């Protein structure tokens, strides 16, 4: 029944042009094995693209756009056909004109197009789509806001290369409101969009902070759905790659207790991201290392260092080692780490097969030794207490073996540790 | 001191649920001994 339909679509009669477009849209909607390939190869896309112009019925525009959208939401190559037919500008101009059914189709289309690659994403933006899309978040129609938010997040996605910041950043004010939505899918997608926007340079982070997002994100770290937790946690973590002032805004918003909650998530990857996130706060100044300790985060962090999956342990080791930095100017910190039992797990981690981490681990152990030494020299004892803890945990042997590591810096720090504290 | 994440995680793809030294460079290197 198909070469016939191709001819009924080419009829100059408006009455039949519709009937045909309607039959195309229907077969293109079959849930099972849609005929997107066959319909494309019958040559009719550029004809459907014409049916979406200003100079066409409201009911024909709809059906042509819905048919095309079913095409554009298939495979990367079937999306490509629709883009190559110059369909995007008319999808975009239908966001202004069309009714609400129509707006929902075009916004979905542009979402699928924007999601195919960083090229198509940039291209949608170049076609000045941002402006109309934002115009949709007045509609107060739940399903259209939901869709507009999905698309919007795809416009923000991708780091290599970033999208054009001066355009996508105009969406911050709208997102800031959207993370207050009671529609789970909206909320989720708004959080993704923020996680992408916040993933960038200090200018981008500050934009996120200035619209007041971070208060709400911190609230969302305790949402019932891990679908919300994950991207929210990520945005917050990106914010704390920033400077001390930026990091301080998130702590001030209450992130440390939320992080406590997340260090006992059932999902391993939430725990891994929380460890990472805390590690970039213990990378911060001396007040912030103390805030981490005061929020009772060290003990679960230590427990993850002993028993968690490898990727999670590495992140926890960063969190604990970065914290020992500040032990040279506040020795209570190191004392508390030691006393929470972090020596045996740090030691046992030295045999991980990752030179990045072995190095961090030895920096943590050196800092513990340096403070264990300045402890006994300050009050005239004949023993480094921490040196003996490391020894009794089989960590001297383990540090010793690090001299046989190919990286010169590892060997050098390890050599230095055995001489200075095990001579 | 701060660490950016290994990669940017994303909605569509996120799912939540080494060499020793040569011999060349091991007699030519100074291995400090403990005491024990």
UniProtKB/Swiss-Prot annotation, chain A:
Q: Annotated region NLS binding site 1: where?
A: 122-248
Q: Which UniProt keywords apply?
A: Acetylation, Cytoplasm, Protein transport, Repeat, Transport
Cellular component GO terms, alphabetically? cytoplasm; cytosol; NLS-dependent protein nuclear import complex; nuclear envelope; nucleoplasm; nucleus; perinuclear region of cytoplasm; protein-containing complex
Q: Does the keyword Cytoplasm apply?
A: yes
State the Gene Ontology terms under molecular function: disordered domain specific binding; nuclear import signal receptor activity; nuclear localization sequence binding; protein-containing complex binding
What are the recorded Gene Ontology BP terms? import into nucleus; NLS-bearing protein import into nucleus; proteasome localization; protein import into nucleus; protein targeting to membrane
Q: Where is this region: NLS binding site 2?
A: 332-418
ARM repeat positions in this chain? 2-35, 36-75, 76-117, 118-164, 165-201, 202-243, 244-285, 286-330, 331-384, 385-421
Q: In this entry, which stretches build a coiled coil? A: none
Subcellular location per the Swiss-Prot or TrEMBL entry: Cytoplasm, Perinuclear region
UniProt keyword Iron, yes or no: no
Q: How is the quaternary structure described?
A: Forms a complex with an importin beta subunit. In the nucleus, interacts with NUP2 which accelerate release of NLSs, NUP2 is subsequently displaced by CSE1:RanGTP which mediates re-export and recycling. Interacts with HEH2, SHE2, and STS1.
Q: Which family does it belong to?
A: Belongs to the importin alpha family.
Entry comment, domain topic = The NLS binding sites are mainly involved in recognition of simple or bipartite NLS motifs. Structurally located within in a helical surface groove they contain several conserved Trp and Asn residues of the corresponding third helices (H3) of ARM repeats which mainly contribute to binding.
Q: What else is known?
A: Binds to nucleoporin FxFG but not GLFG repeat regions. Ran-GTP can disrupt the karyopherin heterodimer by binding to the beta subunit and releases both subunits from the docking site. Present with 2790 molecules/cell in log phase SD medium.
Functional description taken from the UniProt entry: Functions in nuclear protein import as an adapter protein for importin beta nuclear receptors. Binds specifically and directly to substrates containing either a simple or bipartite NLS motif. Promotes docking of import substrates to the nuclear envelope. Together with importin beta KAP95, mediates nuclear import of transcription factor GCN4. Together with tethering factor STS1, targets the proteasome to the nucleus.
Protein name listed in UniProt: Importin subunit alpha
Q: Which organism is it from?
A: Saccharomyces cerevisiae (strain ATCC 204508 / S288c)
Portion held of the full protein: 88 to 510 of 542
Curated annotation (Swiss-Prot), chain B:
Q: Where is this region: Disordered?
A: 1-23
Identify residues that carry Phosphoserine: 16
Stretches for region Interaction with SRP1 NLS binding site 1: 25-36
Subcellular localization(s) per the UniProt record: Nucleus, Nuclear pore complex; Nucleus membrane
Assembly behavior: Component of the nuclear pore complex (NPC). NPC constitutes the exclusive means of nucleocytoplasmic transport. NPCs allow the passive diffusion of ions and small molecules and the active, nuclear transport receptor-mediated bidirectional transport of macromolecules such as proteins, RNAs, ribonucleoparticles (RNPs), and ribosomal subunits across the nuclear envelope. Due to its 8-fold rotational symmetry, all subunits are present with 8 copies or multiples thereof. Binds to the nuclear basket of the NPC through NUP60 in a (GSP1, GSP2) GTPase-GTP-dependent manner.
Miscellaneous note, as given in the UniProt record, is: Present with 2960 molecules/cell in log phase SD medium.
Q: What does this protein do?
A: Functions as a component of the nuclear pore complex (NPC). NPC components, collectively referred to as nucleoporins (NUPs), can play the role of both NPC structural components and of docking or interaction partners for transiently associated nuclear transport factors. Active directional transport is assured by both, a Phe-Gly (FG) repeat affinity gradient for these transport factors across the NPC and a transport cofactor concentration gradient across the nuclear envelope (GSP1 and GSP2 GTPases associated predominantly with GTP in the nucleus, with GDP in the cytoplasm).
The free-text domain remark for this protein reads: Contains FG repeats. FG repeats are interaction sites for karyopherins (importins, exportins) and form probably an affinity gradient, guiding the transport proteins unidirectionally with their cargo through the NPC. FG repeat regions are highly flexible and lack ordered secondary structure. The overall conservation of FG repeats regarding exact sequence, spacing, and repeat unit length is limited.
Q: What is this protein called?
A: Nucleoporin NUP2
Q: Which organism is it from?
A: Saccharomyces cerevisiae (strain ATCC 204508 / S288c)
Provide the organism lineage as a comma list.
Eukaryota, Fungi, Dikarya, Ascomycota, Saccharomycotina
Q: Shown portion of the whole protein? A: 2 to 46 of 720
